[PDB]
Amino acid sequence: RQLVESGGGLVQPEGSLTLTCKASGFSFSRSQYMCWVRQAPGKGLEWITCVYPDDDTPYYATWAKGRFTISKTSSTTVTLRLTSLTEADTATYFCARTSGFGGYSYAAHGVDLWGPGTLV
Amino acid sequence: IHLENVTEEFNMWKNNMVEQMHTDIISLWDQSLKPCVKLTPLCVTLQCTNVTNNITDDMRGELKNCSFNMTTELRDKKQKVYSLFYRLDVVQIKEYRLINCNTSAITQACPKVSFEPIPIHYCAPAGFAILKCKDKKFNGTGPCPSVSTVQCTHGIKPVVSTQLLLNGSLAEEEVMIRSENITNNAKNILVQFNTPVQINCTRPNNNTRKSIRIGPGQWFYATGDIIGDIRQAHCNVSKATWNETLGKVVKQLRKHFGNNTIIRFANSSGGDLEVTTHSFNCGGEFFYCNTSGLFNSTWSITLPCRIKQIINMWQRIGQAMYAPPIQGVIRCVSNITGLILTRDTTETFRPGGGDMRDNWRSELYKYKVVKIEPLGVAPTRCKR
Amino acid sequence: EYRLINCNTSAITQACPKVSFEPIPIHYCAPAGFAILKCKDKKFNGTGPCPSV
Amino acid sequence: DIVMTQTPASVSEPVGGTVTIKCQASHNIRSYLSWYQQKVGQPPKRLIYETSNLASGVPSRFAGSGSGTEFTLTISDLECADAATYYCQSNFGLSDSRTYNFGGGTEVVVKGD
Ligand SMILES: *[C@@H]1O[C@H](CO)[C@@H](O[C@@H]2O[C@H](CO)[C@@H](O[C@@H]3O[C@H](CO)[C@@H](O)[C@H](O)[C@@H]3O)[C@H](O)[C@H]2NC(C)=O)[C@H](O)[C@H]1NC(C)=O
Ligand SMILES: *[C@@H]1O[C@H](CO)[C@@H](O[C@@H]2O[C@H](CO)[C@@H](O)[C@H](O)[C@H]2NC(C)=O)[C@H](O)[C@H]1NC(C)=O
Ligand SMILES: *[C@@H]1O[C@H](CO)[C@@H](O[C@@H]2O[C@H](CO)[C@@H](O)[C@H](O)[C@H]2NC(C)=O)[C@H](O)[C@H]1NC(C)=O
Ligand SMILES: *[C@@H]1O[C@H](CO)[C@@H](O[C@@H]2O[C@H](CO)[C@@H](O)[C@H](O)[C@H]2NC(C)=O)[C@H](O)[C@H]1NC(C)=O
Ligand SMILES: *[C@@H]1O[C@H](CO)[C@@H](O[C@@H]2O[C@H](CO)[C@@H](O)[C@H](O)[C@H]2NC(C)=O)[C@H](O)[C@H]1NC(C)=O
Ligand SMILES: *[C@@H]1O[C@H](CO)[C@@H](O[C@@H]2O[C@H](CO)[C@@H](O)[C@H](O)[C@H]2NC(C)=O)[C@H](O)[C@H]1NC(C)=O
Ligand SMILES: *[C@@H]1O[C@H](CO)[C@@H](O[C@@H]2O[C@H](CO)[C@@H](O)[C@H](O)[C@H]2NC(C)=O)[C@H](O)[C@H]1NC(C)=O
Ligand SMILES: *[C@@H]1O[C@H](CO)[C@@H](O)[C@H](O)[C@H]1NC(C)=O
Ligand SMILES: *[C@@H]1O[C@H](CO)[C@@H](O)[C@H](O)[C@H]1NC(C)=O
Ligand SMILES: *[C@@H]1O[C@H](CO)[C@@H](O)[C@H](O)[C@H]1NC(C)=O
Ligand SMILES: *[C@@H]1O[C@H](CO)[C@@H](O)[C@H](O)[C@H]1NC(C)=O
Ligand SMILES: *[C@@H]1O[C@H](CO)[C@@H](O)[C@H](O)[C@H]1NC(C)=O
Ligand SMILES: *[C@@H]1O[C@H](CO)[C@@H](O)[C@H](O)[C@H]1NC(C)=O
Ligand SMILES: *[C@@H]1O[C@H](CO)[C@@H](O)[C@H](O)[C@H]1NC(C)=O
Ligand SMILES: *[C@@H]1O[C@H](CO)[C@@H](O)[C@H](O)[C@H]1NC(C)=O
Ligand SMILES: *[C@@H]1O[C@H](CO)[C@@H](O)[C@H](O)[C@H]1NC(C)=O
Ligand SMILES: *[C@@H]1O[C@H](CO)[C@@H](O)[C@H](O)[C@H]1NC(C)=O
């Protein structure tokens, strides 16, 4: 059970790209919540967005709302579409899965599984 | 008035007092719904969303937002009204309809009327008397000595439930197992505990009642805008007590089925929620709880619950009652005093029941109605 | 734009035009086992004792 | 909308010592906070999943506590192997605004000979 990212490579300013992440070894289910986080090479980590696979509700950071789109594409994959790219967005992007409680957010435990990050 | 040498014959399975109580409850219930608002105008197309802005995940699929067009005047001037609904009350045709608009009239329970059980005593009319057994360890059938007379029965609360028997009364010494036909798997077994199991139930959601004008002097009660986190309703059942209670039941079942066998408890069976789940309505709202967490053994327990607003009272079809929402939160505590069980070497028992009369039959097993006929003759010394 | 005054609070029923409510003096009569007593006094309070019952 | 501040941004302590790491939230987060340890080139490892409750496989040296808006770690018996960037993650949830702000982190340097 390992998340694996693809779709890396840097794209010039004002371009766009889409990142892909696969659930190798597992399928998405109600206890799992999927998110993306990025880390610029000289920075800490910044949360971008999450999606809940049973109804595909996206959640976004304010700073990301007009540029990032998260969507489920299969029972094993999710993607993140990034637009209006700037050089300031160069970062390692990670696909991650959280867990939690039925009585309070299946995310309220944080990330149990991270993929290798991919840089763009 | 203890009757010193009276040995009278009883049969709880043929007790017409149970039949009367059933009929009386239904009649009172029905007449209370003659006044107050009829909800025909709600049988409209609803446009619903999934209500996800403040929820725990176990509640994620439970509520619908449901916007619709309803009016207050015959002005062809409808207004948008929205109300949250529980999923169980709404059926898909994005477009939805209320579940009962396909088969029945919907009547709003009148919000000022309470059905909270008050113990009721039944009293004999002139010319009649009620007799009762005082014996401990009584079958509920057959003869019993120590018969006494009753003008009025002890009070019995008209509590209506499924699977578990709530409140009412306890057995004198040991859990009693009573049945009409014990070797017949087609019959229910009524088990009366000699000690209660305490159960705590709640609806931990601070709700809001929304008053909607529906007509000229008529109001509809909508619900919505729940304050704070939305959480699942549940019951806690003390765990140690439950386990001990089953041990007592098992011992008594063995006296009837053999002390050399093994029995188990299964999570009931299939069918409608009115059959498969535990049902009660404390606080004014109707709860359906999963007893699979209790009947799981071979010889605190949180039970998840669901809530419905549109209720087809068990006793009939063609009509449905709409329970208005209750403002604030609901909490209640009750005593489980018994079980309604069926049986499928070893043996398996399952929660059953659903027939409202079993909840009264279990109390009215001590009383019998007789007619007084105070006239007779005998040979003697008595000449005009 | 106007509405009828009671369409905001109540049902409106038409009096049936063939039915009259014109007052006719009504006498009340006692059921068996009962009797009605009355005062014949002039200048009676409507309360308290009275002779000539 | 809920943002968390770390302090000290960086520390340095000799092997065998103990580091206190503090995280201050802008809002009460009902003790749902998690903590992570990040090695260079790796995704962060979860140490704590719920305020004080340690993730499976994590030594007791990484225990911590807090309530309300104030949370800390006290990592004992520091080894050079424990030098890492430590991070505070909010996990508040419920609302549709969510925003699981990952707070900042602190750098812990463990000094040898
Ligand atoms: C078994 O018996 C118990 C005890 O009689 C029943 O619970 C009781 O239900 C009443 C009615 O809901 C509760 O009182 C209510 O309190 C609210 C508070 O604001 C008030 O507004 C109502 O007018 C009423 O006073 C009572 O507290 C409650 N008892 C406990 C301990 O909570 C129980 O419901 C019975 N079982 C069944 C299935 O009915
Ligand atoms: C159910 O849906 C309605 C319709 O969208 C939601 O109510 C709206 O909430 C926004 C929030 O500011 C208001 O601006 C709108 O005016 C509201 N609509 C109306 C008709 O008042 C409502 O909150 C939803 N209920 C939930 C999710 O509990
Ligand atoms: C409300 O939530 C339920 C799930 O809780 C949604 O159900 C999904 O419906 C789509 C329709 O194609 C299915 O593919 C999904 O598998 C369903 N989810 C599950 C878990 O079964 C439902 O669509 C949601 N309704 C709205 C209005 O968004
Ligand atoms: C309430 O009535 C209005 C008026 O008819 C409905 O709005 C119309 O919906 C149809 C559906 O396709 C549209 O084609 C019309 O253009 C809409 N009219 C207007 C003025 O917007 C409205 O949807 C009804 N409400 C609900 C919940 O069905
Ligand atoms: C969902 O519940 C949360 C928790 O009660 C509400 O968040 C609070 O809203 C009040 C309103 O002024 C704020 O002052 C608090 O600071 C909020 N809490 C936090 C942690 O920020 C939230 O508004 C509710 N959402 C809806 C749609 O009602
Ligand atoms: C139902 O709730 C009541 C309180 O509302 C619980 O009663 C408490 O039980 C503990 C058990 O040791 C006692 O120490 C407390 O003093 C009790 N509270 C009061 C106010 O007396 C009761 O146990 C709950 N039942 C279940 C099954 O959880
Ligand atoms: C649940 O059972 C307990 C006893 O196990 C009941 O306690 C009774 O409470 C009344 C209140 O005044 C006392 O007068 C009785 O003497 C108590 N009984 C005993 C045996 O002490 C409790 O009321 C029961 N709850 C319900 C809802 O019936
Ligand atoms: C509509 O009523 C009929 C009555 O027999 C019932 O069978 C049917 O299932 C109802 N519709 C839905 C969607 O349940
Ligand atoms: C009590 O129930 C058992 C069940 O088998 C029955 O055999 C017995 O005769 C019953 N006793 C009386 C007095 O009816
Ligand atoms: C149960 O019913 C069957 C039906 O024939 C009968 O034979 C049997 O004896 C009954 N059991 C008891 C204990 O009466
Ligand atoms: C059940 O027990 C849990 C234990 O914390 C408690 O929080 C919950 O409110 C209880 N529910 C009821 C109905 O007592
Ligand atoms: C009993 O538990 C099993 C476990 O899989 C479940 O499938 C079954 O439906 C349950 N029975 C009822 C009546 O819920
Ligand atoms: C009862 O709990 C069991 C546990 O798995 C679950 O499968 C079942 O569907 C539940 N039934 C109801 C009616 O909630
Ligand atoms: C029955 O008990 C077993 C024992 O572990 C448990 O795994 C199972 O889930 C239980 N069934 C229910 C319905 O809780
Ligand atoms: C529900 O929220 C309102 C908001 O002020 C509060 O006044 C009320 O007491 C709350 N009800 C409960 C049962 O907590
Ligand atoms: C409409 O009915 C309400 C009922 O309280 C009354 O107060 C109100 O004045 C009525 N409207 C008008 C215009 O009188
Ligand atoms: C007549 O009314 C007056 C009023 O003050 C009262 O004092 C007087 O006692 C009344 N007489 C009788 C007979 O009740």
Residue numbers in the entry:
A (entry chain H): 2 to 35, 35A, 36 to 52, 52A, 53 to 82, 82A, 82B, 83 to 100, ...
B (entry chain A): 84 to 141, 150 to 184, 189 to 309, 312 to 323, 323A, 324 to 395, 413 to 457, 464 to 503
C (entry chain D): 190 to 242
D (entry chain L): 1 to 95, 95A, 95B, 95C, 95D, 96 to 109
Passage from the reporting paper:
Stabilized envelope glycoprotein (Env) SOSIP trimers contain all bnAb epitopes aside from the membrane-proximal external region and have provided a platform for elicitation of such bnAb responses. Previous studies and more recent imaging of polyclonal antibody responses revealed that the primary target of neutralization on BG505 induced in rabbits is an epitope within a hole in the glycan shield. Here, we isolated monoclonal antibodies from a rabbit that did not exhibit glycan hole–dependent autologous serum neutralization. Here, we describe the high-resolution cryo–electron microscopy (cryoEM) structure of a BG505 nAb that binds to an epitope that is composed of the variable V1 loop and that overlaps substantially with the well-known N332 glycan supersite epitope on the high-mannose patch of the outer domain of gp120 (21–23).
A 3.5-Å cryoEM structure of one of the antibodies in complex with the BG505 SOSIP.v5.2 trimer demonstrated that while the epitope recognized overlapped the N332 glycan supersite by contacting the GDIR motif at the base of V3, primary contacts were located in the variable V1 loop. The model revealed that, although the 43A2 mAb contained a 13–amino acid–long CDRL3 that is inserted into the gp120 N332 glycan supersite region, the primary molecular contacts are with V1 of gp120. There is very little interaction with any of the surrounding glycans, consistent with the neutralization data for glycan knockout viruses. The insertion of an amino acid in V1 resulting in loss of neutralization, such as observed in residue 133 of MG505.H3, would change the registration of the downstream V1 residues and therefore potentially disrupt interactions with Asp140 and Asp141 or result in a steric clash with the antibody. However, when compared to the epitopes of PGT135, PGT121, PGT128, and BG18, the bnAbs make more extensive contacts through their extended ~20–amino acid CDRH3s compared to the 13–amino acid CDRL3 of 43A2. The 43A2-bound BG505 V1 loop remains in the ground-state conformation, which we define as the conformation observed in structures of Env that do not have an antibody bound to the N332 supersite or V2 apex epitopes, which influence the V1 conformation. In bnAb structures, the V1 loop is lifted up, providing greater access to the GDIR motif. We postulate that the ground-state conformation of V1 prevents additional interaction with the GDIR motif and therefore is an impediment to accessing the full extent of this important bnAb site. In contrast to bnAbs, the neutralization activity of the rabbit 43A mAbs is not adversely affected by the removal of any particular glycan, nor is there evidence of specific glycan contacts in our cryoEM map. Thus, while the 43A mAbs have effectively navigated the glycan shield near the high-mannose patch on the gp120 outer domain, they are biased toward the variable V1 loop and are not capable of providing broad neutralization.
